[PDB]
Design a protein around this ligand. Structure first.
Ligand code: KM0
Ligand code: KM0
Ligand code: KM0
Lengths: 146, 144, 144, 146, 142, 140
């Protein structure tokens, strides 16, 4: 198996509609890496405003999606700190290569770099794909246990 | 490269948010068959109400998506009738086999049975798949 | 009996924007149920169906009847303390007239069969706007 | 006795979703009176917030509905001022008697009192009903045209 | 005073999205007065309908904001009646002076007149220290 | 030169629920831009971020500053009559303080290079720094 459907995602993360952007976790290795996806449908509430004339997934939400996927890893790698409210502290080295569109499946991988659990400091890298091609690159995502 | 993306789907169907349920058309043969997809995400407005404790894509929206996909075939097979507001006339032989969940891709095939080049009205069959498994069966969708 | 929207939510798990029964105006356990849905412009599906012309999607008329059908099943028999029913099949649906903002949709469902703790219920359904037939359904089948 | 339907109402009023609260106009007399209705359904977006435990139509939106209805009468009594963006200027003597609930029909009547072609100063009274019973009573609505 | 932030507002009022119209209470004196604010942003769900061509905060929603602020005062002034569902009963003498727009900060004050639940309150809203809305009398019901 | 939001929608193509600039208070073409976003509870994202605690998601603060940035670009040079710009990359973002219901978010974007347009961006609540962005990169 090694899979996780949205009901169990909701037990881990606090995020709800309209700001839960991880539909499924397909693979996870604690303290190491996590693979998951987000489905991109026209029937999402952000598309109307971005944009009326042309529907492109906001890249900033692509950041959020990966961050949430990254958040799951930390929470399942270490839950000694029984607090699932993770906040973005800093993000670095983001480059967007290709528009993500309604219809695409967004395949995401996040890799855990450093964890000093006593503080609440987690650093991660992230890559997002569509059809095996790189759409979003993230060098370093910094998250805070508050 | 025979396929239709969101923008051109919106040039064909009048449907908009939150009731446009075709993301992509991946194959189409005029007057014969159409294959498309709808991505199923937690970030869709119906899941909060269906249901709070357990997110299941309402089966009636699976009828809707397949029927919108069917509607594209009718309109691209014959646009002499320059009007894109078709209405569902009836539906028959719907069985739901498996839940459709956030994370799935809904792959849909609609097959044209009859088009009345005399009376007026289209009849089509529909099938929807998740990971190759059959989730929805529709014997006959009726259009006018 | 009558049943208010507060008591309806005590029976059905459906929440916004997918609860499509406003009131149940008559009920007879194991036999028949009469209810209503008020159709207003101020509903979230009307923007997307359609921008140029607001017609209540026929599939939601299926949804509403079947939600009203579900209430009858849960009140006729609740030994199965499960309110999460799912649509299993629907057969013989025919839409006669567009349902519009301003309309009251008066709905009747008639219980045909119930196989106890197998959890199979079969029901017929009709909808009306101004005494006129707008939706007919031969058979709604549920997995209790 | 032209029944007025959703589409033609939208041709009179600039209001759109989720702030158009007239579904139909069933009777109109230019410069005199107007009767219309608003259908009250659970499937409206304001009901989740007002209130989670008990759905009651916000009394203020009942004001807004009569205000839109009255606004239809003004625009169909006199459109020499081809500016359909009318704003609320004052409201006086509003009483609420009964809760307006999902499933109800809100039947609304507005009566024109005064109208000066000089600025957009139109004064109107208004009553709302559910099952013939009075639910909202308004002595005077004052509307300024921009 | 001491502020009542958002989370604590939701513990006093039963109102939720999209009908909670009080963002913050900056000062409150039980049985006397309450001062609060509502941030007016374009990213609010009513602005698309009011209006497509020109975004103006509906006037009746400013009544609702002040009526919710008033509501906080009543419920904290006396919670012997531990029923937070207070309903509008009457409103009298409303006069809107100026359009409230996206970008503005709506500063609001409600003043308790009488309490017997029967509570009467006056209300005033400001944008840039300028009066946008006046309310002589709000009447409310349990 | 001061501004109301009807004109902002004539510049930017973003609409509800993804227009995140309410007012432009100052703009010097090819140089700097000062704007604001009002943070209210009556905003659609707050229900999901989070149920128990309402905090403006940091990524949407990037979105606000970047929309403010894209206004400067479109007014500084509209020879390229395409108002659909797209984020290409963003670098050196640090979040110092939560943005909450009740706050005003005062934003400043400073144009660095234009051939591809680069910009820095800072966000304040009460004159105190909440968000810092070293480099935003755009591709119209
Ligand atoms: Cl000028 C401009 C155009 C379009 C935008 O949408 C967000 C976005 C983000 C990533 C990739 C494409 C688009 C913008 N988002 C933020 C800031 C500016 C923007
Ligand atoms: Cl009794 C009941 C329970 C739940 C429902 O949700 C819609 C649905 C449709 C298809 C499969 C599962 C669920 C219902 N939908 C329509 C009719 C009845 C229903
Ligand atoms: Cl071609 C097409 C056009 C419009 C539609 O709207 C849904 C609907 C359902 C019932 C009556 C009218 C309209 C469709 N609904 C389902 C399937 C196709 C459709």
């Amino acid at each position: 198996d090694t899979s996780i459907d949205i009901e169990d995602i909701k037990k881990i993360l606090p995020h709800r509609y309209p700001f839960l952007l991880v539909d499924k976790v397909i693979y996870m290795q604690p303290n190491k890496t996590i693979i998951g996806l987000k489905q991109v449908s026209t029937n999402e509430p952000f598309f109307n405003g971005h944009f009326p004339q042309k529907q492109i997934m906001p890249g900033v939400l692509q950041i959020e999606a990966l961050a949430q996927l990254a958040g799951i890893l930390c929470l399942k790698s270490d839950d000694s700190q029984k607090n699932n409210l993770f906040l973005f502290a800093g993000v670095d080295g983001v480059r967007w290569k290709k528009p993500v569109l309604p219809g695409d499946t967004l395949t995401m991988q996040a890799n855990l770099i450093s964890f000093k659990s006593s503080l609440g400091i987690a650093k991660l890298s992230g890559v997002g794909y569509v059809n095996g091609k790189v759409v979003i690159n993230i060098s370093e995502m910094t998250f805070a246990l508050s």
